[PDB]
Design a protein around this ligand. Structure first.
Ligand code: GTP
Ligand code: MG
Lengths: 283, 14, 46, 49, 14, 368, 360, 103, 87
RNA sequence: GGCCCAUUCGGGUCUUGUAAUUGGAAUGAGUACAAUGUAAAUACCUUAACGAGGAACAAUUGGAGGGCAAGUCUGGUGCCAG
């Protein structure tokens, strides 16, 4: 058993890199729900946030940050399924990916394209979620396509990733038993530090406004390059607080910061134990 | 509008 | 003039490159085949 | 072929004589030249003998 | 040969 | 006291030292030699100045991290604003001035608003040298000076790359397509990221032309960045013989003038049979005709070749996608591919007629 | 667009930190209220050296010569040579290259040609024995200043081959929370185109001042004979004090001129060295600039280095102001928790520097 | 060879012989790797020049022994190990495009 | 708008290099350039490089003639020359 | 013309080949009527209908050896060797 002990103790060794993620108040882990247009997503984000925060969040939009643990909180957002551009951006900044697969239709090129863009830009954790398990009377073909999807998913992610199986939708959203142990899978994931993310200060924007002057818009007449506040949590390395820091807002251009006022946490984690339903918050 | 996968991505006989 | 200059700089470049490649080949030969033969010598005792 | 692809050891096809220069038939390539040259050399060798 | 792969240059306007 | 004095920057530095109690000169300020002699006649002032591997690397980096924490435990507006600033998980508002109108006008909250902080390198432009690869599931081969949209760091931008090869590490000379199943080099004018960062590349990002195939086309990493690249495109000069002797020949038309041949004297040529040769002297009366000497007797059915190298330039073209400034936010259209332009303005693809291969059959070779 | 500085002070440090940071600067009013106003020839040739070292950097001198525009570029290095003017020695041009030296595509193999020494500049032995060990423990491992021949002023004619060949990513974070124990004290007394007894007179003067401290004194001796001596008579002396358990060093040099007694110069450099030991703590008053520059372009961590009270001066804090003016970083001077002396420990959080020119 | 194990994980320092002018020469397909267990730097092959552009630097390589079955021609005897994985992905599968290398 | 005139100058260079890409090649990028497929004597103004057979004949300069001159000064000074000897 | 032996010269033997055309039969994976089974449902068992020509309804893995270009690189006693 000594040769077994050597050959198993060997595969604990990895490249020693820095972490750059704090341990006191880490940011909410970015969970991106990625699917081709017509499967899961909305229904799935609604079901997960309803199980997590006891709040029916009908008509979602934007990033949604909830508290799902005693110290793990996480941000839910959904890619628009037709845009390769938004697909690329959330591939570059996501931490967990819920990969929606229409199990009746099979694999699809939108999820294959996301898998390759993520694989080249620093592959995050990926939990595959196969829906539309209403194949036919044939539970035989249900099991066959189940195994084939698991194996094809295992060739794209590491051999032993989690493919999850959702049954039919019942009353607007998914079965809460399945969403309960799906959240049990999300709650233990043990994230490992990436490279671009952990030498770069980035931020997903959950709130947006223009703090321009409307009578200045009445003066000049809507052609104005107008100033904008962008609120959100920031990840990665510490973004410096001096004005003039250059920043790429991924999809509108390059800017430099003007002023930063950090705000108190709108969705904080509270200080064996369990998570109080009072403290299961939502922002 | 369903961009179905094809045989070389499906069977992966590279 | 460009003939003489181009020829002699190409000759210098080739003679540098051959020295560099031969150097790295026999440094990989010497200071790692010594360890290969040391492992073979201490594997022959078993 | 131990670590070679069959799409890598393909067949490069050889080029023909230009159609403007076509009255001098058959642009000859290196196999044709060596068939020319070793014939000339064996005949010069026996002439020298 | 000194000019061949340069891209800068001082601009002496004096 | 002293740090506030140093960084209070409306008072002179000698005033900082005065109310606490120049670098072209390298050696520092000393006293007079006589004052220093009477000061250092004694010596006793300074007589007490006189007299596993993986877990080891992890221990070194955790030692640095605990040094980071126990030296951060300092003044509150020093840590939390200015000496590191806004670590991670801080909820901030961040104000940008001169944001375009189209963002605020067409802000659709489905599409995420991501922002990332550029390093000192990534605000510089110039030639990025990558090694890339046609993605194994992308069907069509890629072509040099056809645009593709790269995702290089935070930026997505359409550029014109040019695929090169260092043919047995001698040149960096220019291919016309990417290879079928392996890596080539490439060079594109874009924002200079750091080396060793990976990227994807896409032919088509819109949805009206999204087709049925795989959309990501290129993968790669960045090898090097520079302000200039020196890449070449082979040009051969072809000429034909018209008067052949033993071991020498008169070559007709690769030059237009005896000045041109004089410029090219002594160059090594070869026939298509691999017979090596050298051009020797321009003939006088027929202008571009010259006298060359070969390894042996070349034939009247040969073509001589002067392999030269012409420099080629990358095209300084760069447009970022700006998909969020559109009313549709898909359907972004940039420069088209060359087949798309030919299909648009109905030009036939360029066909050299004597570039097409044939089925050569050898006649049997008999000699006298 | 441009970070604006005023006056012709710290000129080499401004152009060097602009090359490190990649930020376009302007330096305005280069001695404008003067009889011959504008840039001088030695700093113009320093600009030519910057154009030799980098690539794609555009420098734009004005009509009057009193303002310069430096838009920096990629450090590429290569092999070069620099025929620097008689106004400054080779140390004036090899001192600002030691900052840019480990952060280029190709390794620095430059040979400078001119005067070797000056009263108010760095020498060969100064650059080597003082300024190479602080880089040697800030992260570089292969750096060498060779003398092929040396030339004393005024005619000079000496060549110096600066070769650095460790291209690191970034300098390591310094942690010197101690005062290093001086283990030995050595030196070098050089003389060109004069009699070989002046070197022993210099050595005897320096060691008769040094004889009362209970350490070990060793001064090496080189007279330069032949074509290696240069075109002018000269002689000088450079002492270092050597902490051998860590590698630290504290140096002091000078040179003699027309009418100078060698025992006088030896005892002067000896007393100047002992005063540098007094006013020093883990660095020298002249090794301190590139020490805190490498601490500020290290990783994105905290690096801390001990300094004493007397090392703070108008030069040191104008250095700190220029550092914060270019890339917006502060030093934090925390005092030590023991009170027989006044020593701060300067902690700098380095910016996130890598060298992005070295091909991977 | 590696001690008590059959394979060993390592860290890619730099592709040795990257300036060799001969494709698929044993000098060219030859990588220097720091083993993570004992920290020492060894030298390992790679299957060909074509799979030489899957390793770049600090790549978390996995390497086994080589096993020469006879005195080769263009050999450099004195390199013992061969690269068998890179970043946890078999590079023979990478070479025949069955997997994509994740970062 | 600002992005509008950015977009139209982008579209300008879009148009000019897309019909560069469609339009006819430069002769100098195309290989197999004959005499009749070039501008007539574009090659003097070309600055084109290539390779040659052998190092050409040395142009005798003042420095090389004084090089072998003080060489034979040294040689015939010390009389270390080489002739035949009688048998 | 294929095949076999043999270090060599050579010897031994014999209906053997071909991305050549072509023909109608077979059914199985799959898709599925059911009934049976069973508290009920699954599964086994029984079973009508459809289901093959690239039978594309598209099994792998590893090894041995070539051959090619107006191609590239290196050496040097032309045209060669690598
Ligand atoms: N039968 C079945 N229908 C489902 C399932 N999950 C989702 N749907 C249906 O999917 C329909 C389309 O809406 P969503 O599922 O919200 O769509 P989406 O996945 O968010 O994708 P987009 O339309 O692109 O936003 C819904 O009306 C649901 O009835 C499932 O597991 N089974
Ligand atoms: Mg939706």
């Amino acid at each position: 058993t000594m040769q077994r002990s050597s050959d198993v103790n060997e595969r604990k060794l990895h490249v020693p890199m820095v972490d750059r993620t704090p341990e006191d108040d880490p940011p909410p882990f970015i969970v991106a729900v990625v699917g081709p247009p017509g499967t899961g997503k909305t229904t799935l984000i609604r079901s997960l946030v309803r199980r997590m925060t006891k709040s029916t969040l009908n008509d979602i939009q934007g990033p949604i940050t909830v508290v799902s643990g005693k110290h793990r909180r996480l941000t839910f957002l959904e890619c628009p399924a037709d845009d390769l551009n938004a697909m690329i951006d959330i591939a570059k900044i996501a931490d967990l990916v819920l990969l929606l697969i229409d199990g009746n239709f099979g694999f699809e090129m939108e999820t294959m394209e996301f898998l390759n863009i993520a694989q080249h830009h620093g592959m995050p954790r990926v939990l595959g979620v196969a829906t539309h398990l209403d194949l036919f009377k044939s539970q035989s073909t249900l099991r066959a396509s189940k195994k084939r999807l698991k194996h094809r998913f295992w060739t794209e992610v590491y051999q032993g990733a989690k493919l999850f199986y959702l049954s039919g939708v019942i009353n607007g959203r998914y079965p809460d038993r399945e969403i309960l142990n799906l959240s049990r899978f999300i709650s233990v994931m043990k994230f490992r530090p990436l490279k671009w993310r952990n030498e770069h200060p980035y931020m997903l924007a959950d709130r947006f406004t223009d703090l321009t002057h409307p009578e200045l818009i009445e003066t000049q007449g809507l052609q104005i390059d107008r100033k904008v506040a962008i609120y959100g949590y920031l990840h990665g390395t510490p973004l410096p607080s001096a004005p003039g820091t250059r920043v790429h807002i991924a999809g509108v251009g390059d800017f430099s910061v003007a002023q930063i006022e950090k705000l108190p946490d709108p969705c904080p984690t509270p200080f064996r134990k369990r998570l109080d339903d009072k403290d299961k918050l939502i922002y | 509008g369903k961009r179905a996968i094809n045989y070389q991505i499906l069977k992966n006989k590279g | 003039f460009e003939a003489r200059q181009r020829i002699e700089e190409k000759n210098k470049e080739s003679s540098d490159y051959h020295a560099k490649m031969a150097h790295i080949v026999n440094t990989i030969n010497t200071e790692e085949g010594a360890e290969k033969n040391k492992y073979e010598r201490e594997r022959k005792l078993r | 072929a131990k670590l070679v692809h069959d799409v890598q050891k393909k067949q490069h096809r050889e080029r023909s004589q230009l159609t403007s220069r076509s009255r001098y038939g058959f642009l000859e390539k290196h196999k044709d030249y060596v068939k020319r040259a070793q014939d000339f050399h064996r005949k010069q060798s026996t002439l020298k003998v | 040969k000194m000019m061949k792969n340069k891209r800068g240059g001082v601009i002496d306007k004096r | 006291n002293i740090g506030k004095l140093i960084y209070m920057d409306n008072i002179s530095p000698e005033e900082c030292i005065r109310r606490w109690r120049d670098l072209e000169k390298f050696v520092p300020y000393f006293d007079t030699f006589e004052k220093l002699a009477k000061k250092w006649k004694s010596v006793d002032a300074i007589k007490e100045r006189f007299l596993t591997w993986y877990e080891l690397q992890k221990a070194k980096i955790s030692k640095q991290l605990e040094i980071n924490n126990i030296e951060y435990q300092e003044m509150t507006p020093e840590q939390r604003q200015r000496i590191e600033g806004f670590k991670a998980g801080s909820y901030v508002r961040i104000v940008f001035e001169k944001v375009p109108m189209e963002f605020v006008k067409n802000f659709n909250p489905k599409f995420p608003i991501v922002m990332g902080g550029l390093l000192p390198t990534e605000i510089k432009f110039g030639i990025v040298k990558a090694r890339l690869r046609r993605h194994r599931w992308h069907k069509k081969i890629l072509k040099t000076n056809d645009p593709l949209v790269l995702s290089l760091g935070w930026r997505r931008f359409q550029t014109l790359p040019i695929y090169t090869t260092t043919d047995s590490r001698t040149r960096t000379r220019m291919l016309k397509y990417t290879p079928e199943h392996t890596y080539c080099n490439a060079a594109f004018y874009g924002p200079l990221c750091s080396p060793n960062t990976p990227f994807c590349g896409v032919q088509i990002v819109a949805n009206s032309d999204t087709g049925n195939g795989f959309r990501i086309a290129a993968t790669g990493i960045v090898e090097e960045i520079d302000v200039n690249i020196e890449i070449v495109k082979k040009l051969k000069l072809v000429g034909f013989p018209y008067k052949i002797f033993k071991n020498t020949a008169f070559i007709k038309d690769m030059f237009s003038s005896a000045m041109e041949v004089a410029r090219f004297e002594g160059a090594q040529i070869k026939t298509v049979s691999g017979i090596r040769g050298e051009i020797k002297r321009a003939l006088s009366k027929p202008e571009g005709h010259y006298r060359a000497a070969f390894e042996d007797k070349i034939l009247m059915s040969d073509i001589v070749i002067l392999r030269s190298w012409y420099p080629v330039r990358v095209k300084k073209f760069y447009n970022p996608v700006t998909s969020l400034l559109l009313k549709e936010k898909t359907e972004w259209k940039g420069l088209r591919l060359t087949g798309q332009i030919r299909a648009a303005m109905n030009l036939e693809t360029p066909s050299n007629p004597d570039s097409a291969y044939h089925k050569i059959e050898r006649v049997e070779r008999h000699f006298n | 667009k441009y970070t604006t500085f005023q006056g012709s002070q710290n000129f080499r440090l401004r152009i060097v930190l602009a090359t490190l940071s990649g930020k376009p600067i302007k330096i305005e009013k280069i001695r404008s209220g003067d009889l011959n106003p504008g840039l001088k020839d030695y700093e113009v040739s320093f600009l030519r050296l910057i154009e030799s070292v980098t690539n794609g950097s555009v420098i734009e001198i004005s009509y009057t010569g009193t303002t310069v525009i430096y838009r920096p570029g990629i450090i590429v290095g290569g092999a070069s040579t620099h025929i620097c003017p008689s106004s400054k020695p080779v140390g004036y041009f090899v001192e600002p290259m030691l900052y840019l030296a480990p952060f280029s595509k190709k390794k620095f193999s430059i040979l400078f040609k001119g005067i070797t020494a000056s009263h108010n500049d760095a020498g060969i032995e100064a650059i080597k024995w003082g300024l190479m060990p602080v880089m040697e423990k800030f992260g570089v491992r292969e750096c060498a200043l060779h003398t092929l021949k040396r030339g004393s002023p005024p005619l000079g004619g000496g060549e110096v081959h600066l070769v650095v060949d460790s291209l690191i990513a970034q300098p390591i974070t310094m942690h010197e929370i101690d005062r290093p124990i001086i283990s030995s004290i050595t030196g070098v007394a050089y003389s060109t185109r004069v009699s070989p007894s002046l070197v022993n007179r210099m050595i005897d003067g320096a060691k008769k001042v040094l004889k009362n401290l209970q350490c070990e004194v060793n001064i090496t001796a080189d007279v330069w004979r032949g074509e290696n001596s240069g075109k002018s008579p000269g002689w000088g002396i450079t002492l270092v004090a050597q902490s051998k358990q860590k590698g630290w060093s504290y140096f002091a040099e000078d040179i003699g001129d027309a009418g100078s007694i060698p025992e006088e110069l030896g005892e002067k450099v000896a007393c100047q060295l002992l005063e540098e030991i007094s006013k020093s703590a883990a660095v020298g008053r002249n090794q301190l600039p590139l020490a805190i520059v490498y601490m500020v372009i290290g990783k994105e961590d905290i690096g801390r280095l001990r300094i004493n009270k007397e090392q703070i001066d108008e030069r040191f804090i104008i250095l700190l102001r220029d550092i914060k003016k270019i890339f917006n970083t502060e030093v934090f001077l925390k005092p030590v928790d023991e009170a027989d002396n006044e020593d701060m420990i300067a902690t700098i959080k380095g910016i996130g520097f890598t060298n992005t020119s070295k091909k991977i | 060879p590696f001690g008590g194990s059959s394979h060993a994980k390592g860290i890619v320092l730099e592709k040795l012989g990257i300036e060799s002018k001969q494709p698929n020469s044993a000098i060219r397909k030859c990588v220097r790797v720091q083993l993570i267990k004992n920290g020492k730097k060894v030298t390992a092959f790679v299957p060909n020049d074509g799979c030489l552009n899957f390793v770049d630097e600090n790549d978390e390589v996995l390497l086994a022994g080589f096993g020469r079955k006879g005195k080769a021609k263009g050999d450099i005897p004195g390199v013992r190990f061969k690269v068998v994985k890179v970043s946890g992905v078999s590079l023979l599968a990478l070479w025949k495009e069955k997997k994509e290398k994740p970062r | 708008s600002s992005f509008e005139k950015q977009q139209i100058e982008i579209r300008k260079q879009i148009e000019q290099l897309e019909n560069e890409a469609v339009a006819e090649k430069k002769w100098s990028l195309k290989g197999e350039v004959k005499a009749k497929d070039r501008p007539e004597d574009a090659l003097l103004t070309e600055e084109l490089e290539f390779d040659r057979t052998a190092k050409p004949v040395p142009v005798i300069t003042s420095e090389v003639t004084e090089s072998l001159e003080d060489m034979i000064r040294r040689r015939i000074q010390d009389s270390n020359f080489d002739d035949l000897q009688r048998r």
